Design a protein around this ligand. Structure first.
Ligand code: NAD
Ligand code: NAD
Ligand code: NAD
Ligand code: NAD
Ligand code: CA
Ligand code: CA
Ligand code: CL
Ligand code: CL
Ligand code: CL
Lengths: 260, 260, 260, 260
């Protein structure tokens, strides 16, 4: 459904980001992968996109925690793609600790990437989409953008802001043919959560995978993880014309996390 | 995208219901419509379905406001298709008036259909899906299942109820291959809506299309109606394996209505 | 605080409702209580209520599930008070049980009491509060009016309904000097809940005071029961002048229940 | 009554913060105000707080936008009041502008003061309350912490961030005797707002009162601004025992803003 569209995905050299660039390409969209890692992989990964889906893939490095760098990013990203229809702010970092102790430097880091990066990101993007008369800004928030969890102050503060920011963007460009929504995922066994499948498994020491099928049991009623492909799928739906009038809202995939 | 699957939509003889079945059929699925009207209009709609999408289309009458009648409906609808994977409880009605002047028979009439029917249609269908190991319950609430408007008590109550019933249904069958979600549409220009557009037309004694754009410019920030066709597309998505972990939540297609 | 103010509280011969009336009286209001029980016990509460707080207290039996009786109730209750400034629709019932197995009668009754009863009582009251230019309609919903939970479909539904209905009331009478909010309590150790604690203690075969701690843990993080006197104090406050602008919202007292 | 207890209110030299401190004092609590302004107007309000409520009112200058400054502030404040029982993080600023034109400097300033400040404030304040076993943290978010309005990206994002932070604060200190809640008020006629009123006045060609009516008209059903005094009443209620079990939730006084 997305043939001929130009999309950009932040933090997409791995995890949920990569799975998304994956599905958008499959939908027939040219994509601008972004993130960190061994140049080799990133290339094998970008290279592999044009192979599976027959679209054009481009890689641009950018530490999206820096406002200007981020803004200069999308601009170059757009230059490479020769346009900019779909922007998906996905890059993000997680840190655990009770407030009174949360490192001050970590707090600023999460806010700067998990939230601020979304704003500047959008800022630069909008003029282009506005000019065109069509656009899909897809912010990747999380359950923790609607509800809260212990010792994740910074992460929850950030995501809650992302969701809120999403609304503003939606209303501000209402009817313009442009939409902004925020996918709010649950438990996705990636490195960001694998660090918590082993942390919760050292305070009990019990099986490393028992601390997982347990990790879920406490938050996700489905007792099953949410696969990145599925998220990429949701990003594809948001980009369809079926969603022309779905703006400023949140789309949750959390095995029933928010239902209770 | 749904080849083989069997679907059912209450109140699908016209309006949003009909559009729902149409996209489910278009996606390759046998559907069972239902509703009121001139058998002539119903038969053409039922047949146009088998003709345009090359699938089996069954018609079943039932005054879903009747308990055993609706529960019976479900089973008889399961024999018609020879199984039952998707259920779209979309039947519903309306009445405008201030709380202290809302006929008690209207209050009832609404709660019976708009809320109770979803309950009876579910309980009847659940045992079936539970045995198949797969299932989809799509309840068509509204924006009035999240926020409220004047002189629509009954309707706002039942929707707020369908949303909460949706939540419960999702939790009781988590990880069983069955998901339950609520589509909370915004203004869709149907007859149920055309009735209020005309009431505004006369109240302010203004144009009929001038009274339309007004109804929008009050709740729908996009100033654009939500096409039934899109809602049928959002229903198709809730059926895709992409939404296997999307359960017990609402899917707002409202042009910004709940963003503010 | 409320010296002189004339209040009414459905289902107050016991538990939460009795508390709601107790703080109301304690705050200087004349109160009308109602509900089932032994005419002896009922007289005692009404009795104590009078001489302990120095205000008039009346009783009025009426089965609130009877739409017609309940309306005659407020008018009747209004006559004894010679006014009606505050209305608290508190009465309600529970019934644990899956969906495919929820007795249609158990659903009908909870819907008739927990939801419909609120509507009628409000319709029968608004008129009075409207003419005087001051009113307080305090609805007792529940966290389950905000989020769902297994085997409690009828309850969770009706509760969402109340929150939704509450909003409509507030909007229809906004500015008139009448406010409408919904108190949403967490676990309150009352007969209604003890009954569930006695089931968990039965199912798991553990100590009763233990099952109580286990009940709390699951949904209520504070691990401390919400107290009646508390919900009472909250109801009082909603009647203060600070609340004057607080209308059509939910006041949640659940020890974190809905925060996660 | 809060006699004995000690309280702190950021940004209280005027506006909502000032009315907040006046109510806690009237309740009998010794308070510490903070903010900017003319040392005479500051020292004036400070005096009235003692000469009118018979309590101790200390003053402390500090640019809450600075992480360390706010962390020492609560430090000195505690040492000043000889303790810290109630923290009211109120300090905040606004700036209207559409995402694409919203000043980067203007953004980071709003985030540092409308979100981060709440963080550090809470970070230094907790240790004290934790050791005491009792505490109250009152965050002054806004209706824009639940919903969104155009051209307020920074502000909306920050508020949600707060409503978000509020939850983690509560959860983390759940059952400890310390609660965290957020007051999300609607339009409160203050400078911050008179500025938005004078923008609609000179940008539409009409009275400064013609615009006010509109300001409310659009978002506030009650068509009446919320009074800074009422907010204080809320804050007082939150510090009461009636609210011992009310934690991690928002307390909205918007006049129906969020009900629709
Ligand atoms: N893992 C989960 O359960 C889960 C749940 C909900 C939401 N999310 C979100 O999904 C998105 C990706 O998280 P993840 O799980 O994939 O973690 P990840 O570790 O798997 O991915 C982080 C991605 O961001 C890149 N990144 C590194 N530095 C960056 C920078 N300065 N700017 C931008 N990107 C940078 C990484 O190299 C990587 O590609 C995030 O914003 C996170 O909110 C994850
Ligand atoms: N129009 C909107 O803006 C809008 C917005 C939100 C939700 N909805 C919902 O969409 C669904 C359809 O509403 P609509 O706009 O299509 O109105 P409609 O008038 O267009 O459709 C009502 C459908 O129900 C059928 N119906 C008649 N009697 C019935 C009965 N006894 N039992 C079951 N169905 C019966 C009708 O024949 C028709 O097919 C509803 O539940 C309504 O909540 C509509
Ligand atoms: N216990 C909790 O944790 C909890 C939590 C949230 C909400 N609530 C609500 O508090 C309200 C009171 O519940 P409860 O815990 O006090 O149960 P309860 O058993 O303690 O009280 C029920 C009250 O309703 C009366 N009642 C009996 N038949 C009635 C009828 N036909 N019509 C009206 N009232 C009738 C009862 O005699 C009693 O006074 C309810 O609507 C329930 O939703 C309770
Ligand atoms: N006015 C409204 O309608 C309204 C509505 C919702 C929320 N609020 C909130 O009320 C709180 C106060 O807003 P306001 O309306 O009173 O604006 P205000 O202009 O009236 O008050 C701003 C307060 O912050 C102080 N301030 C100055 N520099 C500061 C600094 N560096 N750090 C901290 N504080 C500083 C000011 O001196 C003043 O006391 C805010 O966080 C704002 O969210 C106001
Ligand atoms: Ca929740
Ligand atoms: Ca709203
Ligand atoms: Cl947690
Ligand atoms: Cl309205
Ligand atoms: Cl707006």
């Amino acid at each position: 459904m997305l043939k001929g569209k130009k999309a950009v995905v932040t933090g997409s050299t791995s995890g949920i980001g990569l799975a998304m660039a994956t599905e958008l390409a499959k939908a027939g969209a040219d994509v601008v992968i972004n993130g960190f890692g061994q140049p080799e992989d990133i290339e094998r990964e970008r290279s592999t996109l044009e192979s599976k889906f027959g679209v054009k893939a481009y890689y641009l490095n950018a530490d999206l925690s820096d406002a200007q760098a981020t803004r200069d990013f999308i601009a170059k990203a757009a230059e490479a793609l020769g346009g900019l229809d779909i922007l998906v702010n996905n890059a993000g970092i997680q840190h655990t600790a009770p407030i009174e102790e949360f490192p001050v430097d970590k707090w600023n880091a999460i806010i700067a990437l998990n939230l601020s990066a979304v704003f500047h990101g959008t800022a630069a993007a909008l003029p282009i989409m506005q000019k065109q008369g069509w656009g899909r800004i897809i912010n990747i928030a999380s359950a923790h953008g609607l509800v809260a969890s212990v010792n994740k102050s910074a992460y929850v503060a950030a995501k809650h802001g992302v969701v809120g920011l999403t609304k503003v963007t939606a209303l501000e460009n209402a009817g313009k043919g442009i939409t902004c929504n925020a996918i709010c995922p649950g438990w996705v066994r990636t490195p960001l959560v694998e660090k918590q499948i082993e942390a919760i498994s050292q305070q009990k020491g019990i099986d490393i995978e028992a601390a997982a099928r347990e990790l879920l049991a406490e938050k996700q009623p489905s007792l099953q993880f949410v696969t990145p492909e599925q998220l990429g799928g949701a990003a594809v739906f948001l980009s369809s014309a079926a969603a022309d009038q779905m703006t400023g809202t949140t789309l949750s995939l959390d095995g029933g996390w928010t239902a209770r």
